[PDB]
Design a protein around this nucleic acid. Structure first.
Ligand SMILES: [Mg+2]
Ligand SMILES: [Mg+2]
Ligand SMILES: [Mg+2]
Ligand SMILES: [Mg+2]
Ligand SMILES: [Mg+2]
Ligand SMILES: [Mg+2]
Ligand SMILES: [Mg+2]
Ligand SMILES: [Mg+2]
Ligand SMILES: [Mg+2]
Ligand SMILES: [Mg+2]
Ligand SMILES: [Mg+2]
Ligand SMILES: [Mg+2]
Ligand SMILES: [Mg+2]
Ligand SMILES: [Mg+2]
Ligand SMILES: [Mg+2]
Ligand SMILES: [Mg+2]
Ligand SMILES: [Mg+2]
Ligand SMILES: [Mg+2]
Ligand SMILES: [Mg+2]
Ligand SMILES: [Mg+2]
Ligand SMILES: [Mg+2]
Ligand SMILES: [Mg+2]
Ligand SMILES: [Mg+2]
Ligand SMILES: [Mg+2]
Ligand SMILES: [Mg+2]
Ligand SMILES: [Mg+2]
Ligand SMILES: [Mg+2]
Ligand SMILES: [Mg+2]
Ligand SMILES: [Mg+2]
Ligand SMILES: [Mg+2]
Ligand SMILES: [Mg+2]
Ligand SMILES: [Mg+2]
Ligand SMILES: [Mg+2]
Ligand SMILES: [Mg+2]
Ligand SMILES: [Mg+2]
Ligand SMILES: [Mg+2]
Ligand SMILES: [Mg+2]
Ligand SMILES: [Mg+2]
Ligand SMILES: [Mg+2]
Ligand SMILES: [Mg+2]
Ligand SMILES: [Mg+2]
Ligand SMILES: [Mg+2]
Ligand SMILES: [Mg+2]
Ligand SMILES: [Mg+2]
Ligand SMILES: [Mg+2]
Ligand SMILES: [Mg+2]
Ligand SMILES: [Mg+2]
Ligand SMILES: [Mg+2]
Ligand SMILES: [Mg+2]
Ligand SMILES: [Mg+2]
Ligand SMILES: [Mg+2]
Ligand SMILES: [Mg+2]
Ligand SMILES: [Mg+2]
Ligand SMILES: [Mg+2]
Ligand SMILES: [Mg+2]
Ligand SMILES: [Mg+2]
Ligand SMILES: [Mg+2]
Ligand SMILES: [Mg+2]
Ligand SMILES: [Mg+2]
Ligand SMILES: [Mg+2]
Ligand SMILES: [Mg+2]
Ligand SMILES: [Mg+2]
Ligand SMILES: [Mg+2]
Ligand SMILES: [Mg+2]
Ligand SMILES: [Mg+2]
Ligand SMILES: [Mg+2]
Ligand SMILES: [Mg+2]
Ligand SMILES: [Mg+2]
Ligand SMILES: [Mg+2]
Ligand SMILES: [Mg+2]
Ligand SMILES: [Mg+2]
Ligand SMILES: [Mg+2]
Ligand SMILES: [Mg+2]
Ligand SMILES: [Mg+2]
Ligand SMILES: [Mg+2]
Ligand SMILES: [Mg+2]
Ligand SMILES: [Mg+2]
Ligand SMILES: [Mg+2]
Ligand SMILES: [Mg+2]
Ligand SMILES: [Mg+2]
Ligand SMILES: [Mg+2]
Ligand SMILES: [Mg+2]
Ligand SMILES: [Mg+2]
Ligand SMILES: [Mg+2]
Ligand SMILES: [Mg+2]
Ligand SMILES: [Mg+2]
Ligand SMILES: [Mg+2]
Ligand SMILES: [Mg+2]
Ligand SMILES: [Mg+2]
Ligand SMILES: [Mg+2]
Ligand SMILES: [Mg+2]
Ligand SMILES: [Mg+2]
Ligand SMILES: [Mg+2]
Ligand SMILES: [Mg+2]
Ligand SMILES: [Mg+2]
Ligand SMILES: [Mg+2]
Ligand SMILES: [Mg+2]
Ligand SMILES: [Mg+2]
Ligand SMILES: [Mg+2]
Ligand SMILES: [Mg+2]
Ligand SMILES: [Mg+2]
Ligand SMILES: [Mg+2]
Ligand SMILES: [Mg+2]
Ligand SMILES: [Mg+2]
Ligand SMILES: [Mg+2]
Ligand SMILES: [Mg+2]
Ligand SMILES: [Mg+2]
Ligand SMILES: [Mg+2]
Ligand SMILES: [Mg+2]
Ligand SMILES: [Mg+2]
Ligand SMILES: [Mg+2]
Ligand SMILES: [Mg+2]
Ligand SMILES: [Mg+2]
Ligand SMILES: [Mg+2]
Ligand SMILES: [Mg+2]
Ligand SMILES: [Mg+2]
Ligand SMILES: [Mg+2]
Ligand SMILES: [Mg+2]
Ligand SMILES: [Mg+2]
Ligand SMILES: [Mg+2]
Ligand SMILES: [Mg+2]
Ligand SMILES: [Mg+2]
Ligand SMILES: [Mg+2]
Ligand SMILES: [Mg+2]
Ligand SMILES: [Mg+2]
Ligand SMILES: [Mg+2]
Ligand SMILES: [Mg+2]
Ligand SMILES: [Mg+2]
Ligand SMILES: [Mg+2]
Ligand SMILES: [Mg+2]
Ligand SMILES: [Mg+2]
Ligand SMILES: [Mg+2]
Ligand SMILES: [Mg+2]
Ligand SMILES: [Mg+2]
Ligand SMILES: [Mg+2]
Ligand SMILES: [Mg+2]
Ligand SMILES: [Mg+2]
Ligand SMILES: [Mg+2]
Ligand SMILES: [Mg+2]
Ligand SMILES: [Mg+2]
Ligand SMILES: [Mg+2]
Ligand SMILES: [Mg+2]
Ligand SMILES: [Mg+2]
Ligand SMILES: [Mg+2]
Ligand SMILES: [Mg+2]
Ligand SMILES: [Mg+2]
Ligand SMILES: [Mg+2]
Ligand SMILES: [Mg+2]
Ligand SMILES: [Mg+2]
Ligand SMILES: [Mg+2]
Ligand SMILES: [Mg+2]
Ligand SMILES: [Mg+2]
Ligand SMILES: [Mg+2]
Ligand SMILES: [Mg+2]
Ligand SMILES: [Mg+2]
Ligand SMILES: [Mg+2]
Ligand SMILES: [Mg+2]
Ligand SMILES: [Mg+2]
Ligand SMILES: [Mg+2]
Ligand SMILES: [Mg+2]
Ligand SMILES: [Mg+2]
Ligand SMILES: [Mg+2]
Ligand SMILES: [Mg+2]
Lengths: 211, 120, 122, 114, 55
RNA sequence: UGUCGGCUCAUCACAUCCUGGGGCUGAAGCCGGUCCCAAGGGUAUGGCUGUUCGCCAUUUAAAGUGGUACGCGAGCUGGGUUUAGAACGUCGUGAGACAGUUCGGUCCCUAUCUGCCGUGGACGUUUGAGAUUUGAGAGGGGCUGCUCCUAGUACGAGAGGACCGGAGUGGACGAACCUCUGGUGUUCCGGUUGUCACGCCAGUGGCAUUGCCGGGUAGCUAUGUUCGGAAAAGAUAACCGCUGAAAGCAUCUAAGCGGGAAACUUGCCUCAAGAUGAGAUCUCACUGGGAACUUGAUUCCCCUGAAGGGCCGUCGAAGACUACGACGUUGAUAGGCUGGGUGUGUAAGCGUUGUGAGGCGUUGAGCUAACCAGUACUAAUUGCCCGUGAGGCUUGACCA
RNA sequence: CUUGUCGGGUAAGUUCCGACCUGCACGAAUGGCGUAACGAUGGCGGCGCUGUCUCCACCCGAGACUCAGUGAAAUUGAAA
RNA sequence: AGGUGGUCGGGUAGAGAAUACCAAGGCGCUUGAGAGAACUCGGGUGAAGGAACUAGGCAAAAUGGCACCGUAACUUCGGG
RNA sequence: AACCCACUCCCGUUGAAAAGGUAGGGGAUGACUUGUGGAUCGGAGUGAAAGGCUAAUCAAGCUCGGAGAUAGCUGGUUCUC
RNA sequence: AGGGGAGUGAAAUAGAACCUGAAACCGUAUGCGUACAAGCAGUGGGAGCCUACUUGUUAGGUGACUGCGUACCUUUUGUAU
């Protein structure tokens, strides 16, 4: 953790090794990141760095945000993110590329997962359905019982019910870096990355490490 | 879920849908200005514009393909003789949609569908 | 994938003509047995003068499936039927010959006897 | 998908002669049996062919020892060392899945002389 | 399933606090001076200074 | 106040079945027996029977015991019990009866309130606004087999066979994803039966479950792919101690100092300032006049409405309606058009061969959804409404 | 009593089939014992077939959802 | 979306007054428009397995025409 | 097949319907189905027998009278000190 | 259709659904209270605000905050039940 880059999910592919094994790969474009603000102990408490990436039109950036992007001459971009760093040193106006990663180098990737609208209990919670025959009355995929009699006499908080298999944010831990294309700004990561093509993903060094 | 899916059901079977949009396209080539519903007008321009493009190259095989998709002798002759020659140099966008209010009976949003360069 | 009640024929000369799976070994609530996994079978048809009899509970190894096996490059191999080899008490083949091809995933340290006898290893 | 195609291009560096379903091809497959490596021939009729660039694939079917077997090769993997067409088949389809219900003289495929 | 006690005057009026109506976005045809709906053709037949329906 | 069993969904206790830590042993080792601590996670599939139970077959690390209206029919079932029909055995002269059998036999309800799962509208946070955040607190997760090395070493006459410590590979469970392997793909391409129509031939279209079929793009998906459970720290349980008197000895305790488990608090993931205790940081906007007083956190009028937000439109792997996200001519937001890709499989017309069905050439041809790239041809107007005029008082510290 | 005992079938059979006789409490026109054909009749077992199931996935229509019009019902001591 | 006696009843396939597409003739069934969630109703397809489901193969899937060959126990001699 | 009937599943149960509908199902030259007209009825009729049917009513129809039957049983019983 | 004026009438809020015209129930306007607060909705204490005028030992509307406080009938040995 403590430092990373923001990229876009470009889609999955494969690469073959000379030994003949094919590695599933997720290609991540990392347009170079620009430091916007450095946060220290005497001004904010915690230590962190604020980063922007991409590019935005001049008619979509407000006067409040334009003056923030102008205190450090950075030029506005899509979104603003903040990485909580333990002990490093940055100055407003720097560049952060894929060049803090190497091959090997387990990382964690965060993204907004694909959104299912309003899911039932079978899809959302892996419930199992009642009978499709043998007398069942209009109660095939319905959840069933949700409590007990007079004792409790109210459903318990946290009950598993239906609705919104979400587009939340999820992290996938311990993903290996396969190739770091420095000149074309690419990160090739072994495995699946949350979200759809085009979404913004955060890449950080693996927190758990070890195996 | 309907991620990245195209088309509109419009509460009809696929046989009803296919037949409704031939009549609506055949009417448009004849009167050059029709009044219909906005969801139906947006789904029509995926049907009648590929016909005007096909009419640009006149041949026996092209006029046989046109008749199969719009089973109307007059409409096939309306294309290949007036349209396709009118829009020979226009790269797409042969028809125009303009919102025009709501129906009285059911409050359905309406629209005007018309060929772009009517000589009037 | 092979589960209980599945019928799969024999790739030996052990007498058994057709067997049926009655258990998949190696874990609780285990569902499927692929190529190279141990199962528990019962004999459903046998040769008149074979060395196994009908209705006999014993252990077999899965050697050939319709579902198939995957390879590292991403390829796949599939057969036209599920086949098994009957093993004795000490996890060893009972018949002496083996029919049809076998696969390299069975070329392990405990089933090398049934790979050296197969007319073809894929 | 504009830069995915660029990553895939730098791995498409093989001959891969043209062939179509119904042909009888021979595929030389790399096999490791310890430290030494050899080539194992797989001969059969092609019944399916997937055209996707790097992710291309094809399926051949052969009767090995009285038991049928089908293998789906990846066209651009290093495992598929080479391929040669031994016979050209004359078929009216693109996927010959009906051949799995025919066994002997009923599974013959005509020849394409030109 | 049906109520056990009848609802009060205040209890049903609170439910209707979200039942108010919004007003349409209108605009004035600059060339003529005719009020029409925003992005729609005028009830006369003018859109963006162009006669389109000839009544 | 609907009574057995099954199904779906659970929640708690600990008198612990497995995994975890220990004392004693009639504990050599491998396996055991018994007691103490421990509730984090796990904890079979079938044959018979209406069965709970039970007995069997084969597994598993183990197939725990109980409370919850013997949990759960305004969540499902209806095999059993317990209506009306009929029959057997037995009892009664008879109508009939039988915790004795047997075959058949209608299971209603659109959710007001509390509760729960998702998702919004209003206002407040003391001038307003754009954006990024800290973390009081809450939830999720925690399972485990086998093989190899140490090592055929310790132990043992032998047979047999480890503790501690490493490496690999699986079962079950969970999440994300669609590169691969497949499924689907009534919006794509073909084959074909019956009939009707387009004047007729050819060529096509309607109807017949998409007429029946063979394939199949994008999207969705598992049976496909990748990942996860940790390590570590603290304070402890049973237990094991060091020093040590009361009580010249002894003694883990009375003062003092340690080791110690899947339990507890962090560590990993998510939500989180309506945390009314409403937090913090960067930047931006607004610098007019009069009057009436019930003479200041007052009211009324005229002028002036900024930063920004909304309405509206083109939409979206976002979505029940919302909300969220992108764009609106200074523009690739959607459709079309132009190239390509993909799928299907050699179109129509014409020319040859044949008496004809048919074959052959032009020809991998014709067509091609949702995909990739480009391009203003078509649609996103040239608008309206909210939101103001420098942000109260007291105390104290630094200034002037 | 009772899932009596033995044999068959099944990896495993309280049901089924063949026997034994200890008939709680069969028995000869409220008929006894058999029987070809027949039965939307009761019990048991096979082949084929399959979404019945492991374990559900995708797709097509009608509701449910939103908008415009018409417009009920059971229930109700009062409800912060 | 119930019930109601009798008569006529064409073409192409077809044994047919069944069934499919049509003629003569008649009609689109007196609320619509969208969108494309859970769930419910009526259907299509499904990898590997094939009754492991269940009180019970309930439901579904499967068979299905004409000509010819061929066909068991048992039997009341017809049959099956 | 028409016609008569009603064995199974599902839907519907505030129904389209106070007993239906879609899929399958039985008989279909006969102890058959059906139109019109007629006969038998309330301790009575009719019944290939289910205590079944006799106008959505049957272990004794409906209607009006005896009749305001009887109710040792529930319920209710009204202004003030 | 229904209204706004004008006219008749002692009186059209006596207008033909026509004397008077209550209650349930439904609205518009003003004044006060109400978005950190848990329960038979009252009662005892009580600030502030608004109105009127006898200008505050007054009258009327509202009731922040706070102490106590589980409806009525019936039937019962006994009911918030
Ligand atoms: Mg979505
Ligand atoms: Mg289930
Ligand atoms: Mg049942
Ligand atoms: Mg029902
Ligand atoms: Mg159903
Ligand atoms: Mg209940
Ligand atoms: Mg309670
Ligand atoms: Mg739960
Ligand atoms: Mg789209
Ligand atoms: Mg059709
Ligand atoms: Mg209520
Ligand atoms: Mg009540
Ligand atoms: Mg009110
Ligand atoms: Mg409302
Ligand atoms: Mg369950
Ligand atoms: Mg749970
Ligand atoms: Mg408790
Ligand atoms: Mg204990
Ligand atoms: Mg235990
Ligand atoms: Mg233990
Ligand atoms: Mg122990
Ligand atoms: Mg012990
Ligand atoms: Mg526990
Ligand atoms: Mg516990
Ligand atoms: Mg537990
Ligand atoms: Mg627990
Ligand atoms: Mg605990
Ligand atoms: Mg813990
Ligand atoms: Mg079981
Ligand atoms: Mg069991
Ligand atoms: Mg049973
Ligand atoms: Mg208790
Ligand atoms: Mg109890
Ligand atoms: Mg209990
Ligand atoms: Mg119970
Ligand atoms: Mg219980
Ligand atoms: Mg039920
Ligand atoms: Mg029950
Ligand atoms: Mg009920
Ligand atoms: Mg209930
Ligand atoms: Mg229900
Ligand atoms: Mg029953
Ligand atoms: Mg039943
Ligand atoms: Mg009876
Ligand atoms: Mg007697
Ligand atoms: Mg009695
Ligand atoms: Mg019974
Ligand atoms: Mg019956
Ligand atoms: Mg029910
Ligand atoms: Mg309540
Ligand atoms: Mg916290
Ligand atoms: Mg809180
Ligand atoms: Mg927890
Ligand atoms: Mg926690
Ligand atoms: Mg030894
Ligand atoms: Mg020794
Ligand atoms: Mg999984
Ligand atoms: Mg895929
Ligand atoms: Mg794809
Ligand atoms: Mg595939
Ligand atoms: Mg495929
Ligand atoms: Mg398919
Ligand atoms: Mg298909
Ligand atoms: Mg696909
Ligand atoms: Mg004609
Ligand atoms: Mg013709
Ligand atoms: Mg046709
Ligand atoms: Mg027609
Ligand atoms: Mg089809
Ligand atoms: Mg068919
Ligand atoms: Mg496919
Ligand atoms: Mg999934
Ligand atoms: Mg620890
Ligand atoms: Mg001492
Ligand atoms: Mg001591
Ligand atoms: Mg101490
Ligand atoms: Mg410690
Ligand atoms: Mg563990
Ligand atoms: Mg706040
Ligand atoms: Mg704040
Ligand atoms: Mg704005
Ligand atoms: Mg502005
Ligand atoms: Mg905004
Ligand atoms: Mg939208
Ligand atoms: Mg440009
Ligand atoms: Mg192609
Ligand atoms: Mg064609
Ligand atoms: Mg041609
Ligand atoms: Mg040719
Ligand atoms: Mg050629
Ligand atoms: Mg082509
Ligand atoms: Mg018995
Ligand atoms: Mg027996
Ligand atoms: Mg046996
Ligand atoms: Mg059985
Ligand atoms: Mg006698
Ligand atoms: Mg008798
Ligand atoms: Mg007798
Ligand atoms: Mg007799
Ligand atoms: Mg007698
Ligand atoms: Mg008799
Ligand atoms: Mg007899
Ligand atoms: Mg009969
Ligand atoms: Mg019988
Ligand atoms: Mg059985
Ligand atoms: Mg549909
Ligand atoms: Mg409405
Ligand atoms: Mg006819
Ligand atoms: Mg007919
Ligand atoms: Mg006609
Ligand atoms: Mg209607
Ligand atoms: Mg509708
Ligand atoms: Mg369905
Ligand atoms: Mg089907
Ligand atoms: Mg298929
Ligand atoms: Mg299947
Ligand atoms: Mg299959
Ligand atoms: Mg089979
Ligand atoms: Mg069973
Ligand atoms: Mg079972
Ligand atoms: Mg059936
Ligand atoms: Mg059928
Ligand atoms: Mg009739
Ligand atoms: Mg009858
Ligand atoms: Mg019946
Ligand atoms: Mg059915
Ligand atoms: Mg019939
Ligand atoms: Mg029927
Ligand atoms: Mg018969
Ligand atoms: Mg018949
Ligand atoms: Mg007659
Ligand atoms: Mg009479
Ligand atoms: Mg009678
Ligand atoms: Mg009656
Ligand atoms: Mg009588
Ligand atoms: Mg009487
Ligand atoms: Mg009457
Ligand atoms: Mg009457
Ligand atoms: Mg009386
Ligand atoms: Mg009297
Ligand atoms: Mg009373
Ligand atoms: Mg008056
Ligand atoms: Mg009057
Ligand atoms: Mg009146
Ligand atoms: Mg009056
Ligand atoms: Mg008078
Ligand atoms: Mg009144
Ligand atoms: Mg008011
Ligand atoms: Mg508080
Ligand atoms: Mg308050
Ligand atoms: Mg409250
Ligand atoms: Mg309280
Ligand atoms: Mg309360
Ligand atoms: Mg007072
Ligand atoms: Mg006062
Ligand atoms: Mg008070
Ligand atoms: Mg009070
Ligand atoms: Mg109190
Ligand atoms: Mg009472
Ligand atoms: Mg009582
Ligand atoms: Mg009592
Ligand atoms: Mg009391
Ligand atoms: Mg009460």
């Amino acid at each position: 953790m403590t430092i990373g880059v923001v990229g876009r999910k470009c889609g999955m592919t494969r690469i073959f090794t000379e030994e003949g094994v094919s590695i599933p790969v997720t290609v991540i474009e990392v347009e170079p990141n620009r430091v916007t603000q450095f946060k220290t102990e005497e001004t904010d408490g915690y230590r962190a760095v604020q980063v922007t990436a991409g590019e935005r039109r001049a008619s979509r950036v407000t006067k409040a945000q334009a003056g923030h992007f102008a205190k450090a001459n950075v030029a506005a971009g899509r979104g603003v993110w903040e990485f909580r760093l333990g002990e490093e040193q940055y100055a407003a106006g720097d560049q952060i590329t894929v060049d803090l990663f190497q091959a090997g180098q387990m990382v964690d990737v965060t993204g907004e997962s694909k959104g299912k609208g309003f899911a039932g209990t079978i899809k959302r919670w892996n419930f199992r359905g009642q009978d499709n025959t043998h007398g069942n009355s209009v109660s095939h995929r319905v959840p069933g019982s949700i409590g007990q009699c007079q004792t409790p006499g109210r459903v318990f908080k946290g009950k598993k019910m239906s609705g919104h298999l979400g587009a939340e944010r999820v992290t996938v831990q311990s993903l290996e870096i396969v190739r770091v294309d420095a000149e074309r700004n690419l990160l090739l990561v072994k495995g699946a990355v949350p979200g759809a093509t085009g979404g913004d993903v955060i890449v950080r060094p693996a927190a758990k490490a070890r195996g | 879920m309907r991620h990245r899916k195209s088309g509109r059901h419009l509460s009809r079977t696929s046989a009803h849908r296919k037949a409704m949009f031939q009549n609506m396209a055949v009417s448009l080539f004849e009167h050059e200005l029709i009044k219909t519903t906005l969801p139906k007008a947006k789904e029509l321009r995926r049907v009648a514009e590929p016909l005007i493009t096909l009419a640009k190259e006149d041949s026996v095989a092209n006029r046989r393909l046109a008749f199969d998709r719009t089973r109307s002798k007059a409409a096939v002759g309306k294309l290949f003789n007036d349209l396709g020659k009118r829009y020979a140099n226009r790269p797409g966008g042969y028809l125009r949609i303009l919102k025009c209010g709501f129906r009285a009976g059911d409050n359905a949003p309406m629209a005007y569908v018309e060929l772009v360069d009517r000589p009037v | 994938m092979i589960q209980t009640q599945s019928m799969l024929d024999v790739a030996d000369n052990s007498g058994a003509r057709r067997v049926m799976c009655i258990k998949v070994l190696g874990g609780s609530h285990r569902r499927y047995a692929g190529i190279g996994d141990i199962i528990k079978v019962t004999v459903k048809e046998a040769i008149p003068r074979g060395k196994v009899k009908k209705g006999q509970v014993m252990t077999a190894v899965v050697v050939r499936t319709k579902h198939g096996v995957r390879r590292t490059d991403g390829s796949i191999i599939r057969f036209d039927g599920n086949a098994a080899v009957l093993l004795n008490n000490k996890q060893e083949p009972i018949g002496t010959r083996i029919f049809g091809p076998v696969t390299r995933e069975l070329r392990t340290e405990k089933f090398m006897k049934i790979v050296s006898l197969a007319p073809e290893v894929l | 998908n504009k830069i995915i195609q660029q990553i895939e291009a730098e791995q498409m560096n093989k001959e891969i002669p043209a062939f179509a379903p119904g042909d009888t091809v021979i595929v030389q497959v790399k096999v490791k049996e310890g430290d030494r490596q050899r080539l194992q021939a797989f001969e059969g009729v092609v019944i399916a062919k997937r055209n996707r660039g790097l992710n291309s694939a094809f399926t051949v079917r052969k009767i090995s020892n009285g038991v049928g077997v089908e293998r789906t090769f990846q066209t651009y993997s290093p495992i598929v060392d080479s391929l040669s067409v031994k016979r050209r088949g004359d078929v009216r389809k693109a996927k010959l899945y009906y051949l799995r219900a025919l066994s002997g003289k009923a599974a013959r495929i005509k020849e394409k002389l030109v | 399933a049906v109520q056990q006690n009848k609802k009060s005057r205040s209890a049903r009026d609170m439910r209707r606090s979200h039942d108010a109506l919004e007003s349409n976005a209108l605009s004035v045809e600059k060339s003529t001076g005719e009020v029409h709906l925003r992005h729609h053709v005028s009830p006369d037949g003018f859109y963006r200074g162009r006669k389109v329906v000839d009544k």
